[PDB]
Amino acid sequence: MVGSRTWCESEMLFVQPDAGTKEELYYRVTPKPGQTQANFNWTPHKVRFHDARPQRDSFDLNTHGFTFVEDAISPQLIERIRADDTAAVEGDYFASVAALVKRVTGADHVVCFSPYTRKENSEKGIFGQPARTVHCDHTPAAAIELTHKLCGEDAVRLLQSRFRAFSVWRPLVEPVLDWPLAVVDGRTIAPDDLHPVHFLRYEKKDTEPPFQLSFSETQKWYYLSRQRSDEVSIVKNYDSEVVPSPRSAHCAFKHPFVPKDAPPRESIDVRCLVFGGR
Ligand SMILES: COC(=O)[C@@H]1C(=O)C(C)=C2O[C@@]3(C[C@]2(C)[C@H]1C)[C@@H](C)CC[C@H]1C(C)(C)OC(=O)CC[C@@]13C
Ligand SMILES: O=C(O)CNC(=O)C(=O)O
Ligand SMILES: [Fe+3]
């Protein structure tokens, strides 16, 4: 893996370009003996990750599908989130995330859900660990289903205004050196790059499935080098409005120029239902 002044090379796990062209893809989170766990495989592919820091303030959610915003929070809230304080996450941090999205987008309503505190080499399952496969958190069907599930009677009225789904990512230890969150220019995503994958649990059908991405040389991947706890990444998973980037995609990668004995990456990401705004 080589690198330069504003980019480096690594790899991420992609699905095949023809994945799901014969049957629906599924991945059993709780695999049981006798039943097939998955009908597809991820494969690593070389990717050039361009450093976003030289042009950090120039990426916006409409043109690229992601943005980086300065937002400082108290070190006490960080240590509480690091201590698995569920009350601090669903209370103070949810209010912090909603206020940050409101002042960035001017939106009317923000609904937080599905918090994921991650640690490198953790044991809190897969979702307490950095993501290794390139994904978009919600398909359009998943984003609409989540609105009806979390907003209920107000879903139809809210879906008449602009609806967006965000992943609000923030590191808990700084700076992020290893396993950073890469993001792709949404304008460089082809429709053939998106593959719905149903994550199964005890045979329950996944009505909120994500997109899994296949590699493409056209994809321009970015990452904010040495990201700090005061720099928040907002990655767009869905957008009802037709913009140059209807969505983005994200994944973590092994940085090739970081010492092996570096402290493990720690972060928390929260999904957002965003209504209105610009
Ligand atoms: C390697 O990267 C990953 O495995 C991703 C990941 O880390 C997580 C945490 C996920 O959460 C998903 C799918 C992803 C994006 C996976 C693909 C599933 C598995 C649980 C929660 C749901 C939910 C909130 C109900 O919304 C849905 O639309 C269905 C898909 C998500 C967003
Ligand atoms: O933090 C990671 O490694 C992966 N994060 C996400 O998938 C997210 O924020 O939605
Ligand atoms: Fe994600």
Author numbering: 1 to 278
Quoted passage from the original study:
The active site of NvfI is located in the DSBH core and an Fe is coordinated by the His135-His137-Asp250 triad, which is conserved in α-KG-dependent oxygenases. Further, the crystallographic analysis reveals significant conformational changes of two loops upon substrate binding, which suggests a dynamic movement of active site during the catalytic cycle.
Phe127 and Trp199 in loops I and II, which undergo dramatic conformational changes, may function as gatekeeping residues to load the substrate into the active site. The substitution of Phe127 and Trp199 with Ala completely abolished the enzyme activity, while the E208A variant increased the activity to 144%. Furthermore, the substitution of Phe127 with Ile and Trp199 with Phe dramatically reduced the endoperoxide-forming activity, while also forming 4 and a product with m/z 461 (total activities were 6.7 and 25%, respectively). Although the overall structure is almost identical to that of the wild type enzyme (rmsd value of 0.8 Å for Cα-atom), a comparison of the two structures revealed that the space around the carboxyl ester of D-ring and the active site entrance is significantly increased due to the substitution of the large indole ring to a smaller benzene ring. As a result, the D ring of substrate moves ~1 Å toward the 199 position, and the substrate is not suitably accommodated within the deeper part of the tunnel, while the C-13 position is still close to the iron-center to generate compound 5.
